Coordinates of C-alpha atoms and ligand atoms in Angstrom, one line a residue:
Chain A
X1 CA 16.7 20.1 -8.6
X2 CA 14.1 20.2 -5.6
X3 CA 13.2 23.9 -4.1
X4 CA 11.1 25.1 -1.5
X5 CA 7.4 26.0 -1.8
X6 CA 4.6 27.4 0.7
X7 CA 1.3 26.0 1.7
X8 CA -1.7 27.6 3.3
X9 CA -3.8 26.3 5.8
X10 CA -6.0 26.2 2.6
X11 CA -4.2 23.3 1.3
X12 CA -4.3 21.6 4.9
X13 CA -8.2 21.9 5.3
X14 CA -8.8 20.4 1.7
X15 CA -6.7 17.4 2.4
X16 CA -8.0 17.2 5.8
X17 CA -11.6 17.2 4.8
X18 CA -10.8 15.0 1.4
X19 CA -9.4 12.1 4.4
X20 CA -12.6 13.4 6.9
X21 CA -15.6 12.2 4.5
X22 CA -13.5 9.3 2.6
X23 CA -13.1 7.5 6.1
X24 CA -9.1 7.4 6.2
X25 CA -6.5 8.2 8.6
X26 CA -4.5 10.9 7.7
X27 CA -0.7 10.5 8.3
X28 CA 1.0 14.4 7.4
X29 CA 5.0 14.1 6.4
X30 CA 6.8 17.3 8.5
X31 CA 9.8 19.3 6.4
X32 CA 13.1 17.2 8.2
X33 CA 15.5 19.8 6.1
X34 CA 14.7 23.2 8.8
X35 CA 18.0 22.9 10.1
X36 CA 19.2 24.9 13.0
X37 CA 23.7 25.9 12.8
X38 CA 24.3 23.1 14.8
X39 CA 22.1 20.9 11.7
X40 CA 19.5 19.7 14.6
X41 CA 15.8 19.8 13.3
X42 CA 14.3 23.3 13.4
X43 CA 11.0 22.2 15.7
X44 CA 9.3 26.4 14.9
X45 CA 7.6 25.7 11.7
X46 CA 5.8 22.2 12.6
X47 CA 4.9 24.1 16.0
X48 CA 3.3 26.6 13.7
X49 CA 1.3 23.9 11.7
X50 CA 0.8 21.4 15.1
X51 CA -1.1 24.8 16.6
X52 CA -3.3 25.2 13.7
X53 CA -4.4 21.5 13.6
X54 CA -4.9 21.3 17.0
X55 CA -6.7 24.8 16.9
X56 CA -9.0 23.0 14.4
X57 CA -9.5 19.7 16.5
X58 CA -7.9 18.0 13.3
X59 CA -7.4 13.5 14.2
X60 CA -4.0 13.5 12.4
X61 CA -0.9 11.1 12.5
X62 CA 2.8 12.5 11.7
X63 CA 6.0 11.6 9.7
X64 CA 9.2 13.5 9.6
X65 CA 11.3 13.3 6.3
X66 CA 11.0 11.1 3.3
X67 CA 13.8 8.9 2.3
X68 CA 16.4 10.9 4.3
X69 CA 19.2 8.7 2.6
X70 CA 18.8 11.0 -0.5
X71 CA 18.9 14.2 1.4
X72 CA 22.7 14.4 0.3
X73 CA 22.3 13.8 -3.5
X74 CA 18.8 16.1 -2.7
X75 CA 19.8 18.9 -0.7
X76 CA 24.1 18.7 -0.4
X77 CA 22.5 18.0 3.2
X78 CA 24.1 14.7 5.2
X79 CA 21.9 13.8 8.3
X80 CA 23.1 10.6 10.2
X81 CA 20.8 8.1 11.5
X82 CA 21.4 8.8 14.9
X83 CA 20.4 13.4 14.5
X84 CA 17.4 12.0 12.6
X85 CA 16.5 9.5 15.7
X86 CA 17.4 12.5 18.3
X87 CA 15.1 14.8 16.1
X88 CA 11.8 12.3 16.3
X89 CA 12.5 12.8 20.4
X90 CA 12.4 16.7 19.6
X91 CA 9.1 15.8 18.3
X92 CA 7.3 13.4 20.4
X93 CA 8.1 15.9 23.0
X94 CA 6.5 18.3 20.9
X95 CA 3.2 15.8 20.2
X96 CA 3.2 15.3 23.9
X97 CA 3.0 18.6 25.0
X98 CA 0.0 18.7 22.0
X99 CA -3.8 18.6 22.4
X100 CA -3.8 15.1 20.9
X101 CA -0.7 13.7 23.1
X102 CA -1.8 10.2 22.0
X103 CA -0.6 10.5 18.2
X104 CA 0.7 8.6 16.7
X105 CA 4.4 8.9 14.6
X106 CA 5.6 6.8 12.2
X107 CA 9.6 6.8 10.7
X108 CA 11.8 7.5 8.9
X109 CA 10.4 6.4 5.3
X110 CA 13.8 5.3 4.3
X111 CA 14.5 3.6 0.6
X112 CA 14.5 0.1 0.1
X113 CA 18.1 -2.1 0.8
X114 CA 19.2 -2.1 -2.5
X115 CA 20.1 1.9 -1.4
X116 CA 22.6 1.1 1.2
X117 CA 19.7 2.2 3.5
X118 CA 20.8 -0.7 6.4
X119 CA 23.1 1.8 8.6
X120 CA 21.1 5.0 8.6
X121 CA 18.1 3.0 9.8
X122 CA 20.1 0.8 12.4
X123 CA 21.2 3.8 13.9
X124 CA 18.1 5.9 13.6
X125 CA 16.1 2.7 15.3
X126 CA 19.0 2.7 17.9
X127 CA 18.8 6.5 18.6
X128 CA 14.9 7.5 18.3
X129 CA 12.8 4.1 17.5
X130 CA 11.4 4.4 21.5
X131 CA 9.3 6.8 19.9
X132 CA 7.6 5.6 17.1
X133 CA 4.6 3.4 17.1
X134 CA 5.8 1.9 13.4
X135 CA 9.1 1.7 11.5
X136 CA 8.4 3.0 7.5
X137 CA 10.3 2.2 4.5
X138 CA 9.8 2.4 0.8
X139 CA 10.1 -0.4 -1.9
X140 CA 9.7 -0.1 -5.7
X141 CA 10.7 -3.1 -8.3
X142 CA 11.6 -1.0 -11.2
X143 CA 12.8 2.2 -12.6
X144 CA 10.0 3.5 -14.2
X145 CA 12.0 4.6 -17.7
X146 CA 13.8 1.6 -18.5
X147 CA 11.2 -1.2 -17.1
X148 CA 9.4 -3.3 -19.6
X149 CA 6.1 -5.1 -20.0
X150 CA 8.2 -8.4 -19.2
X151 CA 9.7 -7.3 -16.2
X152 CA 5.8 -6.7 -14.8
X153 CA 5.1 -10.7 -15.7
X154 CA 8.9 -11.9 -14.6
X155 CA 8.4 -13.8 -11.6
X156 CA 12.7 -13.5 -10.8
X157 CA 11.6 -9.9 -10.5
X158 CA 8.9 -10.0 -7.7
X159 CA 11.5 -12.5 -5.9
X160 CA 13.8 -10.0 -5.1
X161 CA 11.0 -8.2 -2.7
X162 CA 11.2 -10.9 -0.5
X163 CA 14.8 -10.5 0.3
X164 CA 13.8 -6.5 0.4
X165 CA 11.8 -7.8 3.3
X166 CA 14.3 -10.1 5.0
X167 CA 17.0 -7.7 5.0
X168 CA 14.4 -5.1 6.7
X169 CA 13.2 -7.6 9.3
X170 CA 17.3 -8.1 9.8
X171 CA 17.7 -4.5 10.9
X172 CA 14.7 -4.5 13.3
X173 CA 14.8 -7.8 14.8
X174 CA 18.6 -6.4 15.7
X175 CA 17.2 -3.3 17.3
X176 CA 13.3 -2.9 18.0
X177 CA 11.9 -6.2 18.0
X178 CA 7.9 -6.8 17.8
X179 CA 8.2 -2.8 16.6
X180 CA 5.3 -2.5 13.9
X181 CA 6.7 -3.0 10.2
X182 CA 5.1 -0.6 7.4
X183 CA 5.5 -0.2 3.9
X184 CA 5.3 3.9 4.1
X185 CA 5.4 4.2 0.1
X186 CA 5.9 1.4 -2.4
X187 CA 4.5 0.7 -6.3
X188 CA 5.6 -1.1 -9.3
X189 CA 8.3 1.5 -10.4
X190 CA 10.3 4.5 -9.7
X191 CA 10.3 8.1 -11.3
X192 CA 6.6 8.1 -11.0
X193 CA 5.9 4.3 -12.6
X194 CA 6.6 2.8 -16.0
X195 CA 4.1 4.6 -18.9
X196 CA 1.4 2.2 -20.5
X197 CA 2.6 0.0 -17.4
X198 CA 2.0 0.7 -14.1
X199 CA -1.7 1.8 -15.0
X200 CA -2.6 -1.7 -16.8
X201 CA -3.9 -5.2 -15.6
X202 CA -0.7 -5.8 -16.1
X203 CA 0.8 -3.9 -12.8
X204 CA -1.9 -5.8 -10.7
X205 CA 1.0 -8.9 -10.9
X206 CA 3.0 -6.6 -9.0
X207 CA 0.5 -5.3 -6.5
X208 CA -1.4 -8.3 -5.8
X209 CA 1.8 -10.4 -5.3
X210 CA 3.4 -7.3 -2.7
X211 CA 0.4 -7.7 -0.8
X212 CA 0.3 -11.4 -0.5
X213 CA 4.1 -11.5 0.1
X214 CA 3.5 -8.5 2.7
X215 CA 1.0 -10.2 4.8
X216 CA 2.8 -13.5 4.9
X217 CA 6.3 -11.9 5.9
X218 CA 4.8 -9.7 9.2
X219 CA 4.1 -6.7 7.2
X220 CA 1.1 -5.0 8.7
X221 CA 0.5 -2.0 6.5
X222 CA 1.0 -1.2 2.9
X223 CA 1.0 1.9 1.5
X224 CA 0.0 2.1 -2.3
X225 CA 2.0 5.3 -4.1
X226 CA -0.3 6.8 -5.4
X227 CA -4.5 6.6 -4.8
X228 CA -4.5 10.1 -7.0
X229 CA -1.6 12.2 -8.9
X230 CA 0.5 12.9 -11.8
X231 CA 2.3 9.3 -11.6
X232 CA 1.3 6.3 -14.0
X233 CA 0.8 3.7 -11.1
X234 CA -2.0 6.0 -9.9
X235 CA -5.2 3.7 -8.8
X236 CA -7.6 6.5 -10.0
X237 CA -6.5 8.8 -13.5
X238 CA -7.0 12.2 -13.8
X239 CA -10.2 12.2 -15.1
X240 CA -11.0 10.0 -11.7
X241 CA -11.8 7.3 -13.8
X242 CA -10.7 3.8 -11.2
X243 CA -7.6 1.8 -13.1
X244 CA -7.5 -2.0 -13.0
X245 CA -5.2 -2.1 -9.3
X246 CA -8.4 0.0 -7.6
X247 CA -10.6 -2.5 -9.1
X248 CA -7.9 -5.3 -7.6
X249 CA -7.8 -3.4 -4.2
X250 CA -11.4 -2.7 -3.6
X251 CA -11.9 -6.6 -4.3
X252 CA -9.1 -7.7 -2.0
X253 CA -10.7 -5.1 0.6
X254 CA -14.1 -6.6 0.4
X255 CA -12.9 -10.5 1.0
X256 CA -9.6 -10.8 2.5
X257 CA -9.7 -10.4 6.6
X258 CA -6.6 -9.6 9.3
X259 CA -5.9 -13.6 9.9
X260 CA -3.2 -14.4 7.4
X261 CA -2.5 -17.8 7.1
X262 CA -0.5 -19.8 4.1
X263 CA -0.4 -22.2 0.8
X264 CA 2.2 -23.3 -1.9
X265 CA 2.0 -25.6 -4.4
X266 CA 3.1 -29.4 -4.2
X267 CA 5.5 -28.9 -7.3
X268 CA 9.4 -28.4 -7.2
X269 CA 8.6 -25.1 -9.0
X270 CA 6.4 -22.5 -6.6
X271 CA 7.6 -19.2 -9.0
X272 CA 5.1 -18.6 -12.0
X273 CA 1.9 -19.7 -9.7
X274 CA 2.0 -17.8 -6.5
X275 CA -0.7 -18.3 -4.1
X276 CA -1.8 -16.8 -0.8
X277 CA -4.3 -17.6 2.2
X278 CA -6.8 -15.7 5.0
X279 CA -9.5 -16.0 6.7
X280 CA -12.6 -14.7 4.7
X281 CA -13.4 -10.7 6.0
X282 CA -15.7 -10.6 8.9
X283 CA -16.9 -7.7 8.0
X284 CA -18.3 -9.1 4.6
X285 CA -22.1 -10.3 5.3
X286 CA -22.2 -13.2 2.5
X287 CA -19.6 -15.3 4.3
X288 CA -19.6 -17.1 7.9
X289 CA -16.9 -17.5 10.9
X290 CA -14.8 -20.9 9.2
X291 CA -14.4 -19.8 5.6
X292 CA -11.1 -19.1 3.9
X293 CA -10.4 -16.9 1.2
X294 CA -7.5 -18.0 -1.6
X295 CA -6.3 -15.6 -3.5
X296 CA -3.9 -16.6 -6.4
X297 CA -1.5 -15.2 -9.6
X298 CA -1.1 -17.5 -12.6
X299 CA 2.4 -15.8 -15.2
X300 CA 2.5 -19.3 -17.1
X301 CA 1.0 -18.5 -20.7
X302 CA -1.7 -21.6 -20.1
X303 CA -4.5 -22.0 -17.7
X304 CA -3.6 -24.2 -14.6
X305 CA -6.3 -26.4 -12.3
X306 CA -6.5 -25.4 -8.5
X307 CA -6.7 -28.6 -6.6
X308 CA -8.0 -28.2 -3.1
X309 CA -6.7 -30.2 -0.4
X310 CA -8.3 -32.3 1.9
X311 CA -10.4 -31.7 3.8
X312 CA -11.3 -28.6 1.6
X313 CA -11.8 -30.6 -1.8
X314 CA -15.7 -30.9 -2.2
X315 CA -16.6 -27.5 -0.5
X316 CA -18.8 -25.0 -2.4
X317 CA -16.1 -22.3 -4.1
X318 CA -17.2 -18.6 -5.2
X319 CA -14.6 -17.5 -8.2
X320 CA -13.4 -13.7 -8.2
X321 CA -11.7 -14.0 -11.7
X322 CA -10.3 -10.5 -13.1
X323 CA -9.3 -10.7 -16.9
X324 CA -8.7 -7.2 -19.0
X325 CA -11.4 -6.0 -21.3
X326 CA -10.0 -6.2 -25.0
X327 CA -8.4 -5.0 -27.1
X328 CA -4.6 -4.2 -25.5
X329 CA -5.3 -7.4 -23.0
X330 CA -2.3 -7.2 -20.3
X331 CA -1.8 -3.4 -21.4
X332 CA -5.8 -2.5 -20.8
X333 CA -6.6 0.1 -18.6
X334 CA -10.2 -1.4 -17.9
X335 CA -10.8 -5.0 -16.2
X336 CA -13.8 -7.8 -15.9
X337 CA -14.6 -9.6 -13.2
X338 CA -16.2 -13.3 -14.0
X339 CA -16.8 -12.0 -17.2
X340 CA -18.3 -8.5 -16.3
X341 CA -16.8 -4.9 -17.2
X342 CA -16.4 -3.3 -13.7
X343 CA -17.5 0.6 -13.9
X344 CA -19.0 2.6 -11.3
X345 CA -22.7 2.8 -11.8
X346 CA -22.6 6.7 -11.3
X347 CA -20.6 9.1 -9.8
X348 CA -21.9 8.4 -6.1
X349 CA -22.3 4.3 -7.2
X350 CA -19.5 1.6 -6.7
X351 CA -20.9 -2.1 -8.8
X352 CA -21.6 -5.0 -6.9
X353 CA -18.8 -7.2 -6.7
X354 CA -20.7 -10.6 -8.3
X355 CA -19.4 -14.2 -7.6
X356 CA -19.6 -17.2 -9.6
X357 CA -19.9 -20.0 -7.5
X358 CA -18.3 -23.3 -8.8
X359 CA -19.5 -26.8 -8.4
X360 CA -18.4 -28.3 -5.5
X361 CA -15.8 -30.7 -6.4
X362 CA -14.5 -28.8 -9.3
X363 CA -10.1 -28.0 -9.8
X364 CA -10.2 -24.3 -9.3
X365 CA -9.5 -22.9 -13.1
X366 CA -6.9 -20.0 -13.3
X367 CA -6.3 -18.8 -17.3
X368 CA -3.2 -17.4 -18.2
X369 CA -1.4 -13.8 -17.2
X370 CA -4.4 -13.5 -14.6
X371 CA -5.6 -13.1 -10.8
X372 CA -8.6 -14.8 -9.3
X373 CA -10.0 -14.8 -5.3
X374 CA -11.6 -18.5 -4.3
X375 CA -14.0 -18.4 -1.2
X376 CA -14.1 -21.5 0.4
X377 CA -17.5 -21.1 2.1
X378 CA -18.0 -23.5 5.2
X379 CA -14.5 -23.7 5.3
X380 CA -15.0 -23.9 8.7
X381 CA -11.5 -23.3 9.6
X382 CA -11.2 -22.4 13.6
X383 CA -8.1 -20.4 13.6
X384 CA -10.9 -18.5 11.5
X385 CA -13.0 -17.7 14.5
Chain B
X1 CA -0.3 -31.6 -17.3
X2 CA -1.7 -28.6 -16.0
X3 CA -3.5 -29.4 -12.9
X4 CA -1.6 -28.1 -9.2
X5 CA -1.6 -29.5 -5.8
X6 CA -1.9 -26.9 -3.1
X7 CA -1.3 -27.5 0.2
X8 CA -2.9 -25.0 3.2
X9 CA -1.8 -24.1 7.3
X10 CA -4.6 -23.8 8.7
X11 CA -3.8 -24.7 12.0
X12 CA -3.4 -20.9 13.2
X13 CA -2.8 -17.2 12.8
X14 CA 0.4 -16.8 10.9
X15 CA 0.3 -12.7 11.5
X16 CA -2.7 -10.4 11.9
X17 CA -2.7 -7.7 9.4
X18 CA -3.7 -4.2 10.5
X19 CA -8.0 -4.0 9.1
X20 CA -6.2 -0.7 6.9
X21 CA -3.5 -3.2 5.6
X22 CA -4.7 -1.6 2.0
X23 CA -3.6 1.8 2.5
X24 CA -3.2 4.6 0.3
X25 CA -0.7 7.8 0.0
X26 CA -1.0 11.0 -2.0
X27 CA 2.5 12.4 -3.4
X28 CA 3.5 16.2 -1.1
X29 CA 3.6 17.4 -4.8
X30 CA 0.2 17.1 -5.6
X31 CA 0.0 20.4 -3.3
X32 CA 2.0 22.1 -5.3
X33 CA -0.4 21.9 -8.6
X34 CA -2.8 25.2 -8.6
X35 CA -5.8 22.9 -9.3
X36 CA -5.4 20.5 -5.1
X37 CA -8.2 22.4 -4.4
X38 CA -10.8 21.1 -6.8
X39 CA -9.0 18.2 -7.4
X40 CA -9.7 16.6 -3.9
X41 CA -13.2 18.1 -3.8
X42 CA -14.7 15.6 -6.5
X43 CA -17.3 14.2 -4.8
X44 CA -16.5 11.0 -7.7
X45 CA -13.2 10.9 -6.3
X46 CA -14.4 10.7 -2.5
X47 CA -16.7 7.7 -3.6
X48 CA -13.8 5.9 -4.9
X49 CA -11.6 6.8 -1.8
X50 CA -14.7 5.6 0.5
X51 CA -14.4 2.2 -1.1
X52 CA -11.1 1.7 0.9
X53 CA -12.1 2.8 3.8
X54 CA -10.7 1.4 6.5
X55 CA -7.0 2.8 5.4
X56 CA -4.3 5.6 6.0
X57 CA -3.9 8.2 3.4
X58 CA -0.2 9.6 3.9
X59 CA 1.0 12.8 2.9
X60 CA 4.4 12.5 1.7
X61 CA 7.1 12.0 -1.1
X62 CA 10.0 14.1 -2.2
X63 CA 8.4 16.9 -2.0
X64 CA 8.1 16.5 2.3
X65 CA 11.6 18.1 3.1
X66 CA 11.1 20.8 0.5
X67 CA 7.4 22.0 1.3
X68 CA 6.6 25.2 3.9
X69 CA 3.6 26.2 6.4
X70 CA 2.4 29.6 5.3
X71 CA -1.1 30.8 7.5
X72 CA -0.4 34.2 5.9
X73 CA -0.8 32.6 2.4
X74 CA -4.2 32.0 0.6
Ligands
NAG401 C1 14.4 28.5 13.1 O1 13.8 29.2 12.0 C2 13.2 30.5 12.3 C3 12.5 30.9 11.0 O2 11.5 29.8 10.7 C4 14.4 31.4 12.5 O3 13.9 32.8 12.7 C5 15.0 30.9 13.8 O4 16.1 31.9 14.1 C6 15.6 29.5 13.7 N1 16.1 29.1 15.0 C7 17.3 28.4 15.2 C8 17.6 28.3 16.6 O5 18.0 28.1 14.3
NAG402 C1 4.9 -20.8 -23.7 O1 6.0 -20.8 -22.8 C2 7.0 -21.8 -23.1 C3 7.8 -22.1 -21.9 O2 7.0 -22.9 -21.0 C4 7.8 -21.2 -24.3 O3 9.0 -21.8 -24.5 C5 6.8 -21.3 -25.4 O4 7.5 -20.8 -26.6 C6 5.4 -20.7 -25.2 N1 4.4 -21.2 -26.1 C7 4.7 -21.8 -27.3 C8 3.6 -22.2 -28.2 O5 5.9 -21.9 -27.7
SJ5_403 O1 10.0 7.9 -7.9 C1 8.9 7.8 -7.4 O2 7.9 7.5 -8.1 C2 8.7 8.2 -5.9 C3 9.9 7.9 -5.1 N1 9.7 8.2 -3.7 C4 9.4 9.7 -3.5 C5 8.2 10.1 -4.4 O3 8.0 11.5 -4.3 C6 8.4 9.7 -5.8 O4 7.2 10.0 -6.6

């Protein structure tokens, strides 16, 4: 299927500088099938590119492969776990011997469980994880051409992620405990996302609820596939027009901080309303040291009431309520918060992202099919501080 | 009825996500379509990108262990 292609140093400056003036942390996946006889990793070509960067005084991280498990069905190429850890040696040494010796490398991006993924990365943690500062792997939900809109809003199928998780955890905790767990790649669906799906409201259930579920099992990055590109669960289109998951992001960005903490609800039933708890973000300057923010997924097809315990019940609440803008509802590709259409103001202009504070004392009111954040200001929570 | 009881840990820290916890990638094939150039050059797009700032952007998909430095190539 898959052949090889070039790239100039063209290509490198544009995504380079495209990372540079965004204010992101470039992480650049090396080519793991350069094999030498012997199939060890051919270290010459990398070299090639690590001089360049390094002739440019480019801050870059590094990866080597993506989801080696499929090299076989990719490339009739079979690397064990154990080559592919010896090969991330070959290139710390390489990094080390570098003009930015402190880099970082992350590895090996390898598929979720469910691909029989446990015994390649047992034995690649075994053989190379001394070297890298974070273990990767992928995880989608769904294949992209056969997943339906009731799959997106089925909460038996965002369970399943938290065994994903588990069984991950399993591996690690057996091999390279308190090593850094990262989702390297992960969306709603597979062969590039499910059309008329994965760029809806309706694929922030699946986002929204990954990140919630990520934070609370000791996941410490996530990586959304894909910011920008050909694939439906693509946060911005190709006309760079932002879809409703960047509008879901950029809102989770702006009031959700490091501290994760945790809530469920009192019921024997804790599946169709999933909620999640942190500390407000710091960094935010409408909210104080204290004050938590709630961040919560309703999939019943009737508005619930929030109830606040004690000693939280009478505090003053600021709603983030996103709803699609009509007509396809669930299927939209544009979203309101609190009632307001969310568009950039101009090309160089983000909105302002507008509360609506409740009465204190009010049940926190969650519609249907829908997402809401729920600042609890004065909070004053200490774990907070 | 339609009215939930939550109940909140508060007590402590659970876990401490990384401040780029949000992070981003763009798919190794994107460098493969004749139009990367201009396509990451919209100043629009680097707005949008900006707004998730803190976060790592990584380079990578299928595309990774198929995909060739050239700095003879233009
Ligand atoms: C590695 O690849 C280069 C070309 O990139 C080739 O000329 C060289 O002989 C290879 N080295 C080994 C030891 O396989
Ligand atoms: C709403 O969901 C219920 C299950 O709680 C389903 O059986 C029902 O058909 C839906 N609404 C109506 C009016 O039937
Ligand atoms: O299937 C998908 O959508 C993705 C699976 N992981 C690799 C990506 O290149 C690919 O785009």
């Amino acid at each position: 299927k898959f052949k090889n292609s070039t790239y100039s140093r063209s290509s490198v400056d544009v995504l380079y500088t495209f990372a540079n003036c965004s204010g992101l942390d470039l992480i650049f996946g090396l080519n793991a099938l350069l094999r030498t006889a012997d199939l060890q990793w051919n270290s010459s070509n990398a070299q090639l590119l690590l001089d360049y960067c390094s002739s440019k005084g480019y801050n870059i991280s590094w990866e080597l492969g993506n989801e080696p498990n499929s090299f076989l069905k990719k490339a009739d190429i079979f690397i064990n776990g154990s080559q592919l850890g010896e090969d991330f040696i070959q290139l710390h040494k390489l990094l080390r011997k570098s003009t930015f010796k402190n880099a970082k490398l992350y590895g090996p991006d390898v598929g979720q469980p469910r691909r029989k993924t446990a015994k390649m990365l047992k034995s690649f943690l075994k053989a190379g994880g001394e070297v890298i500062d974070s273990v990767t792997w992928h995880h989608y939900y769904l294949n992209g051409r056969t997943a339906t809109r009731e799959d997106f809003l089925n909460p038996d199928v965002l369970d399943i992620f938290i065994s994903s998780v588990q069984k991950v955890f399993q591996v690690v905790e057996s091999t390279r405990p308190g090593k850094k767990v990262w989702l390297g790649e992960t969306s709603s669906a597979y062969g590039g996302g499910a059309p008329l799906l994965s760029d809806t409201f309706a694929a922030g259930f699946m986002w929204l609820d990954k990140l919630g579920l990520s934070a609370r099992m000791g996941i410490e990055v996530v990586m959304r596939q894909v910011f920008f590109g050909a694939g439906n669960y693509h946060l911005v289109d190709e006309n760079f027009d932002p879809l409703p998951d960047y509008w879901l992001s950029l809102l989770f960005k702006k009031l959700v901080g490091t501290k994760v903490l945790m809530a469920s609800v009192q019921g024997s039933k804790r599946r169709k309303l999933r909620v999640y708890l942190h500390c407000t973000n710091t960094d935010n300057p409408r909210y104080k040291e204290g004050d938590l923010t709630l961040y919560a997924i309703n999939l019943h097809n009737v508005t619930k009431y929030l109830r606040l315990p004690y000693p939280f019940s009478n505090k003053q609440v600021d709603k983030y309520l996103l709803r699609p803008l009509g007509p396809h509802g669930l299927l939209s590709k544009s979203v309101q918060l609190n009632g307001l259409t969310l568009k950039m103001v101009d090309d160089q202009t983000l909105p302002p992202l507008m509360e609506k504070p409740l009465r204190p004392g009010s049940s926190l009111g969650l519609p249907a099919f829908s997402y809401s954040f729920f600042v609890i200001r004065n909070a004053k929570v200490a774990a907070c501080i | 009825q339609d009215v939930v009881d939550l109940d909140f840990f508060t007590q402590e820290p659970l876990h401490l996500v990384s401040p780029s916890f949000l992070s981003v990638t763009i798919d190794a094939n994107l460098a493969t379509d004749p139009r990367f150039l201009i396509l990451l050059g919209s100043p629009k797009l680097r707005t949008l990108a900006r707004g998730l700032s803190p976060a790592y952007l990584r380079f990578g998909g299928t595309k990774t262990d198929f995909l060739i430095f050239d700095p003879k190539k233009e």
